[PDB]
Amino acid sequence: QDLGVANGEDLKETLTNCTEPLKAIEQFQTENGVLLPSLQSALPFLDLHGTPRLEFHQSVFDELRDKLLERVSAIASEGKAEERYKKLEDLLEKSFSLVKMPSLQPVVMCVMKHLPKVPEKKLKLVMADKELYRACAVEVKRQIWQDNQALFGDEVSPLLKQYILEKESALFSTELSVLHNFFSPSPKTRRQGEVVQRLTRMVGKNVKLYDMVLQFLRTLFLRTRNVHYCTLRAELLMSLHDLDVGEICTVDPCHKFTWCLDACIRERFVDSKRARELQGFLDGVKKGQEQVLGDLSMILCDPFAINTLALSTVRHLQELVGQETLPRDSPDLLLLLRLLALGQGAWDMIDSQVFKEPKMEVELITRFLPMLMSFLVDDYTFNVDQKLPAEEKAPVSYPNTLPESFTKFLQEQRMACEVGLYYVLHITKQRNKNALLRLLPGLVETFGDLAFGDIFLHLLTGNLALLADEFALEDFCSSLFDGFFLTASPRKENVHRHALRLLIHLHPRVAPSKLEALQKALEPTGQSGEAVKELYSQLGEKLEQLDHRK
Amino acid sequence: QGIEQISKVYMHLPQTDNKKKIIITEDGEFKALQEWILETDGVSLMRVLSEKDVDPVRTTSNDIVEIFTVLGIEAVRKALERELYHVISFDGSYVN
Amino acid sequence: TKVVVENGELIMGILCKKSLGTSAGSLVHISYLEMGHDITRLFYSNIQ
Amino acid sequence: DDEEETYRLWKIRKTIMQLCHDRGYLVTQDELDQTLEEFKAQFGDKPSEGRPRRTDLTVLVAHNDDPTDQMFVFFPEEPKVGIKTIKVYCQRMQEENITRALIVVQQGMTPSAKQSLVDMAPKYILEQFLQQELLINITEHELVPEHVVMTKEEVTELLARYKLRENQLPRIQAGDPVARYFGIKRGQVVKIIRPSETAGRYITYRLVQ
Amino acid sequence: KAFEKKFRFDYTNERALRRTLQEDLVKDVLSNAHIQNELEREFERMREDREVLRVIFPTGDSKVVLPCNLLRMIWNAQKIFHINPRLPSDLHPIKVVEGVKELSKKLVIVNGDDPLSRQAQENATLLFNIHLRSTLCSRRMAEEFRLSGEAFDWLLGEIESKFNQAIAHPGEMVGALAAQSLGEPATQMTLNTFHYAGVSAKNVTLGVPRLKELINISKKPKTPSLTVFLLGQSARDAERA
Amino acid sequence: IMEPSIFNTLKRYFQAGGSPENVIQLLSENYTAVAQTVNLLAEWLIQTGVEPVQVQETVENHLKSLLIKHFDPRKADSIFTEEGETPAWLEQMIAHTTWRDLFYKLAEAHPDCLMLNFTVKLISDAGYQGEITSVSTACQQLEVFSRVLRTSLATILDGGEENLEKNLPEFAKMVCHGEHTYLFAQAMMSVLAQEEQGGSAVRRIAQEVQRFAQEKGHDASQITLALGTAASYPRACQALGAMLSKGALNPADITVLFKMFTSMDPPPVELIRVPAFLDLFMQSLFKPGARINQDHKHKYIHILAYAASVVETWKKNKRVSINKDELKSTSKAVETVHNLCCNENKGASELVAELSTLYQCIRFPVVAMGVLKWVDWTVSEPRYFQLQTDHTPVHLALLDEISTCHQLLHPQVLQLLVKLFETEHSQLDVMEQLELKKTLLDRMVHLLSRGYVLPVVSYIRKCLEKLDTDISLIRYFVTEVLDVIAPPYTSDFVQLFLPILENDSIAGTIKTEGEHDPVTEFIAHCKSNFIM
């Protein structure tokens, strides 16, 4: 019973009252009906019909509403911008009083959707109503969010938490596979995730909302130290790139760098040309725009970028061994190390607000890398010696001693630790058990316990699946589990989960005595988490099935 | 221009549907598209097949040893079958 | 000019070499396949 | 020319991708059929002393199952390949632990290197292909029927069902271009499905000799 | 659409079923939906056979050699059993479908039960089974043939018998038979008096000078050729050609 | 908004009683707002949209009919109309009788016999007797059908030859819907054609109705012969009845007719003047094939000559002076033309040679009509235009001769020309097709020269506007027409020739004329003629 509106309230009254005034009721319909003289002559036909006069009028109303929606869309699409926007604004002014009418609410919502700027009073009225706010299209919600950072944060935070949970769950997948691991999906496939698509739709072409999302990502990266926020930054930027959103891609200083790095991640290798392009992007940061360096380091802190760069570094070291050249003389290797240093120092750079490139330690290049090359060199010579004719076979034992300086580098230098961990992954992928056993004792104590990180442990268990036949040897299992996994499992639940996953996958090949010992050693305590207990129960079920197969 | 081991090449539009491009329309009915075909006087496959705007699938040959060098033995079996049927049924006769 | 042999009786048509000759699907070929081979010998002899 | 060179390299890349997929390897779907413009964007659009030069596009592919064995393909810079050039590739392979590999020669190989290729067959297998062989995927030709390599268990099943020996099957050359395409060794029965105008479908078998 | 109109056996129509079948069979078809499902499945099989044929025969021709002349056998059954096809028929279409399936089971080129022999049997009688489904379907037997139950049983027996008679006899000297079958038309062929109709046509060496080149593998043919088919727009443009 | 149902809520309100839970709920069934008024406010909202034009009310009524078509209550239509009341139908037929009852009685038409009766009576109450008849089957009740026939006949007779093509299907779908109505209409045609003071148009309309009857599927020739005086002489009329029931020529039938003709007691000549009979004669005589066996051929020619030659003087239903002194020349001409159509000597080595004799023959109207039909059946053969002399204008020169020597065949000549012009000729060169169109337009210009202009220009405008043809063709037509005409300009020609010239390619008409001025002269004369 609003503006020029008859009974909605006295309609409820009309449904409650029920005595007698027929002519009053008829006059009310005549005054508040379809006020067209042409319909008065057509109504007796409807009376001559027999079906009650409700379905016909509802059908006509629905058809008129759908035609009005089509015309609102057509007006939004056709004509000069000023004229169409003025027509839509007039229609909204005439129709906004009916926004709470469910049958006409879609028309108002569509008109608001197609307006570049909805009046602020109507936006506040919509915000005050939870149902109206929920029913609004994302275009109106953007105009609401751009001036209400708290509401936008409330809308975005569940998506960020879901993204983090999805990445962590992907790290703890039941299937151990070298072919299908955390880094297997292509970047285009990764950007098709629900969280990334929803965030891209929410941001749209609004630069302010994109900056708010970037600020949220920076704050959460600082507060939680979770690198998947960096991953999400890269994926959101490239998802806007895939939709040709030039309003954002042209103003983001990291767009070209992230695009080139995305190509490198897709190829899983950084060639000299791409390395030089990334270097040109880095050296192009002008004085006074140094915060762009913090943003670029956040992009490089992405685990996919770190994985690609470290694998490229290991491959380049192997190539340098092949070419009889030193690491210091390879500009591409130094450039890869510089990119890795920026990626690793992203957190410190953002937290301290000191936007300067981290100084690469001299001893890394001049000592640590050529020692890794010596490990490769020992591998090559052992492999060549094993292929010699039996008449020339000296009793060549594989070098099992780990230099103390190598362990010190792994413990004290973050970059050396990262490169050594990726070298361990590389040699494990090559099924080199001797080198793996040589390097394993140095992984017990690493810089910041990087050897116990979920990404490295995921990749390591996946690659260890390639050495399944070696788990029949008690010495190999003792080394691996007792010397590496069980040293940290009582203090780290994630290491316990990774060891349980590896055992679940490889139990048919583990020596039965060592299998029983590991089952006893990995028994969950009262303080163990739910996931550990679930994995242990799965292991028990698998063991029962294996016993039944005897 | 062109390749070696070839003399003047003659091009024409086919009349028999063996050379006419038989396509299947969206309503399932066959249709005989009459498109230009070439017909050389020398022989060199794996080099004409490498040329641009040349259909690398339906480009057959007349010599059998050349196909045996290019397309193998079973393709040579099919080509010998087709050429033998051609030389037999040219004059309207039929052999099972 | 439309040869129809039906139920073992010549309904209509004039039998040229396309009806009794060595062409496939002719009257004699069907007489060989549907009937026996002695019967086709009798057919040839009777025709001649 | 430079556009002709990038077109030729892209066609060789496409044929090698299709060859690896038909051989039973891990070939990425977009890599299996990419646009020429995509190749030019990924590699540089100047083979004439430029970004899409040789040795940049050495394709490394693993097997669909048992992902250990790889045949990371080779593209020599020089037209006429020799022993002192293939020994560098042998060095790269012995650096790895994988025994199969394909080299795509531009001109003919020196016959001494042809003998050298056989001179390491039990150790590690090397196949070679000319440019003209890889400018057309011959399995797409209408004269070439469907060749499928058979496993040893299927060979035993075939010989036990038909009660015949490997000496009695119709055979196929080891230097057969289709056999070279699938890279089958001696004694490896290949089933061949071809349409027949008298029975519909006919499956023959070709033991390799 | 012609294929669907001619082979589907639309069961929803009342009057067509009344004209083609007897009323008990009409109500049997219209009541049960399992029979309708089986008829839909046989139309599915015929669509699959259509796709298989169009793969097998890219050229639009269907003059193919097969042992049993099924149309002539249907006509013979009509003439023997005195059909009078004006009256509604009295053979159940489910009987047609099941009899066709049993007959396809009974026609054996390759014995055995292991899947290799099963595939050999399927491939040996693929084309003939496609033709058997096409000719002895429910729709045609109900509309344009109208055989009776005993006529259909006799037809199945005749088809099985005449297929079992067409099997190649073990011990037949096939090699000499084929050699003579190819060398007997060789005498009727010209030597080289081809009209040489100069419409390009390359003066294809034909006749015995070509049969010889095919018989002994000549590395120096009198006239080696190609047939270079153009790929795209160049095939429909004389200038690009 | 349950207010909109005051009436039925009424008798359930004062006399509810018992348990009025359903009464209260149906009193409470309009749970929405006043959406009846909101539906009218949808027009006000459309006022801010594109267009809630009167077409908005039309669309509302269309949705009304759309949801009405579900019930459309035949069920109680007879009861509700036998209630002897209801200004509902009367008011609807007063105001909205455009297509509402039209679709209503086009939908079912078996029930609602009294709604149909009221609508039909209101249609009869409308002035132009039968335009809203909700059915073209308005030929069932005689008092309606006779008056509708009268008014349609008045419309056609006041129309003329131009309206002969537009109104005749709209008139023949009624009188051929029922053959008893066809008999009634043909009896009226006969009674009106008894008079010689303007009954020729009535006879023409009757013949067109009979032609439409033959098209639709009537065996209406027996009715036509029953209406005529030919039945007074029984056996000839019976022979004609059988022959026209079969629609083909039998030599035995024509020998039976010929034995009765060319005697001292001929039948009245109106038995042989029926046009379908002569059309069958043309079909059986001047088809390029269809050979006639040389023995009763002269009988055919004599029958045609007697049909198209002799005169008579009906002085009180009796003849006293007929003559046969020109049917020898007619027989000679038709015989020569049939011989020319029978010789078919390849590429007219003889058709070109005897063209002077053909020109002599086509001086006669029946000869001209026969040659027109033969050229129609020869040129319209697919893949005919492969002989080319000047893109084959020989038969088109015969078209020009036919258009020159006569005037009543011009509708058929234009029909043939536009049929060839609309026909796309496959396997011909595109330039060759264009020059063939140019030759056809030259023939159309020749038709325009001999007086028959308005239909030609009307078709040119129709093919420039509707399913528009090449603009260059219309430009060429204008160029060729304006190179032969100039000074005086009857107003109808100017009125029809102005819009095609002034709109849509002014500039292309004048390129290099010079010595005689272009369309500028026609523009000046058009300014001088009309009132600006």
Numbering used by the authors:
A (entry chain V): 6 to 555
B (entry chain A): 1299 to 1394
C (entry chain A): 626 to 673
D (entry chain E): 2 to 210
E (entry chain A): 914 to 1154
F (entry chain W): 57 to 588
Could you share sentences copied from the article?
In the PEC-RNGTT structure, we unveil that RNGTT is docked adjacent to the Pol II stalk with the OB-fold inserting into the root of stalk, and positions TPase at the RNA exit tunnel. The OB fold, known for its affinity with oligonucleotide or oligosaccharide, mediates RNGTT-stalk interaction and stretches its OB loop (residue 476-484 aa) into the gap between RPB1 and the stalk. TPase domain of RNGTT is surrounded by the OB fold, KOW2-3 of SPT5 and the Pol II stalk, with its catalytic pocket facing towards the RNA exit tunnel. However, in our PEC-RNGTT structure, the association of RNGTT disrupts the original binding interface between KOWx-KOW4 and Pol II. The typical position of KOWx-KOW4 in PEC is occupied by the TPase domain and part of the OB fold, leading to diminished visibility of KOWx-KOW4 density. In our cryo-EM structure, RNA protrudes from the RNA exit channel and reaches the TPase of RNGTT. Docking with the crystal structure of mouse RNA triphosphatase into TPase density, we observed that the 5′ -triphosphate points toward the P loop of TPase. The DNA–RNA hybrid adopts a post-translocation conformation as that in EC, instead of the tilted conformation described in PEC. Cryo-EM 3D classification of PEC-RNGTT showed two different conformations of the NELF complex in the RNGTT-containing particles. The C-terminal region of NELF-D detaches from RPB1 funnel and trigger loop, leaving the funnel partially open and convenient for NTP delivery to the active site, and trigger loop swings away from funnel helices, recovering its mobility under this conformation.
